[PDB]
Amino acid sequence: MASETFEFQAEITQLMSLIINTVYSNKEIFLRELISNASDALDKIRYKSLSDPKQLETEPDLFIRITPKPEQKVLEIRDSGIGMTKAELINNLGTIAKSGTKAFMEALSAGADVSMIGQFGVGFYSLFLVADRVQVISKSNDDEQYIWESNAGGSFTVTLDEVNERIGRGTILRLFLKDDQLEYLEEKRIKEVIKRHSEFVAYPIQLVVTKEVE
Numbered sequence: 001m002a003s004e005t006f007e008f009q010a011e012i013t014q015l016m017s018l019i020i021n022t023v024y025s026n027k028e029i030f031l032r033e034l035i036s037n038a039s040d041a042l043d044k045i046r047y048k049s050l051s052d053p054k055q056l057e058t059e060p061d062l063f064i065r066i067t068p069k070p071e072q073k074v075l076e077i078r079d080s081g082i083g084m085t086k087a088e089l090i091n092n093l094g095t096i097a098k099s100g101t102k103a104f105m106e107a108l109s110a111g112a113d114v115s116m117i118g119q120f121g122v123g124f125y126s127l128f129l130v131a132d133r134v135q136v137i138s139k140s141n142d143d144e145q146y147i148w149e150s151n152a153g154g155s156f157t158v159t160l161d162e163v164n165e166r167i168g169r170g171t172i173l174r175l176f177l178k179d180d181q182l183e184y185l186e187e188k189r190i191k192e193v194i195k196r197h198s199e200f201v202a203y204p205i206q207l208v209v210t211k212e213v214e
Ligand SMILES: O=C1CCC/C=C/CCOC(=O)c2c(O)cc(O)c(Cl)c2C1
Pocket: 033, 034, 037, 038, 040, 041, 044, 079, 081, 082, 083, 084, 092, 124, 170, 171, 173
């Protein structure tokens, strides 16, 4: 598959740098940000399905699912929400600087809690606290499955998905964790963070665990 390359909006890049380099502690917050988005996307499919029940048939179950993958140092966060089409992947995750991107960078500088990122509607980028490379794998009812990829550089890429498993509907966040952030592949740590900061979530939050049989 041919891949297409795009430059990040100049302030989105700034922000990613202020994230990767400016904030230190409380990096566990990336999880609630990515669970929050998962819920906000599941909300939209559940709303749309009220007047278009057929929207749900491509994936009748509404859930949030986290999968630790120790071997490839990867943490994945899936939902069966509304999904994103190629154009939205492009617009919502790079080319267009969502209103508030610069505002949070300013807030942050004046002395703001990095945990307030979500209230500026930029929570997505908080993932770079624990990861240096990310794959966003989406499937909308109205397009094929695609892969959006950023390595924290200045650009990103979108490629028709012919390599990943078929998600019926929704999105997968394949975070490639930093060597010093691998505690998030642990069942207990994840399970902790989730209970402390994600109590009021309307959807099933499944944790996928792999254990050798003795
Ligand atoms: O804009 C996004 C943030 C959520 C608000 C809903 C947008 C419409 C679809 O959005 C998504 O599929 C989606 C998701 O499922 C999980 C995520 O972590 C992110 Cl970032 C997104 C993209």
